[PDB]
Design a binder for this molecule. Sequence first.
Ligand SMILES: NC(=O)c1ccc2c(c1)nc(NCCOCCCCNCc1ccc(OC(F)(F)F)c(Cl)c1)c1ccncc12
Length: 327
Amino acid sequence: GPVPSRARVYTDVNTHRPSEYWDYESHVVEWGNQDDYQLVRKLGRGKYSEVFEAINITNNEKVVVKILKPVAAAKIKREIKILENLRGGPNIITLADIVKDPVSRTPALVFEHVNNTDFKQLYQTLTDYDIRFYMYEILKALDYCHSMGIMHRDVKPHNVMIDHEHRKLRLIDWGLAEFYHPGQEYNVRVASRYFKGPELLVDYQMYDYSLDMWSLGCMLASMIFRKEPFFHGHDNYDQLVRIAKVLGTEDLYDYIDKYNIELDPRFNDILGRHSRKRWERFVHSENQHLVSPEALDFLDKLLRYDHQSRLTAREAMEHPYFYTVVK
Ligand SMILES: NC(=O)c1ccc2c(c1)nc(NCCOCCCCNCc1ccc(OC(F)(F)F)c(Cl)c1)c1ccncc12
């Protein structure tokens, strides 16, 4: 059957931490006071929760409250433990409190507020310099969480908060985040369609931190080529075909042969035969100001089928693409 895989970095971080670190089920939640927070307005509703802008009346500061739906109320300890483990880390959203919502009777997570008043799609209107600057800021968060034995598993623009006025970035929504344990088989139903790595699409469960680096490459490709999303799958099956139309089918077949993966036979009639396209195929007069040989080389090194071949967050921070960014 499938060949095993393990991360090439931070492989054993959880084995050398005390069990209290990663055994989230044993964690005892310290509950705050729901009365400290006054809900102001609804910001959005997901499949398992709703988010509100709120005021912490003990300091008159804005906060964001995520109220869990009764269905998710049970599996909150994983997210809580990860948020507490990562608290204070570079560009990681701060969990300010955990309270029981008086209406839903479910857990409510209280987060640091980031000014989210930059309307439109700042995501598709940044300058070349600002793309590099913010990409480096995301990498500080990803190297931190990966160094802390945690995979985010939902890297996408909707989970990157930017206060453009103060050039502040936070990586949010650790609701799909997991502890990495070598040899552990994980659920492939993670990340959002357009940002799903090939490992998820071919049903390879023994993945690791490198899944976040594929998602990151999808964001970079979308920004530098002004193509939102870069890999525009109609469903999870077509998502792999869209990738194959860019990266080619040969490397895809080499990847599945290397890990002894059994490709879903539904792929036989839709994958076809494609050769790798050179990255300049995506360059045109409207995106040429964001494209550089450094950007293309960096992107090439993130968007690889083989999860063990992609740059790690630390290798990515060493890339020449970031030499122009003030440190
Ligand atoms: N943990 C929680 O559940 C959580 C924690 C905190 C918040 C939260 C959820 N949801 C909030 N609003 C609802 C979700 O609103 C998502 C808007 C995302 C906007 N991408 C902006 C953007 C712009 C440019 C980008 O490119 C780059 F290169 F990075 F520069 C990228 Cl990748 C992304 C919120 C608002 C204010 N302050 C804290 C929170």
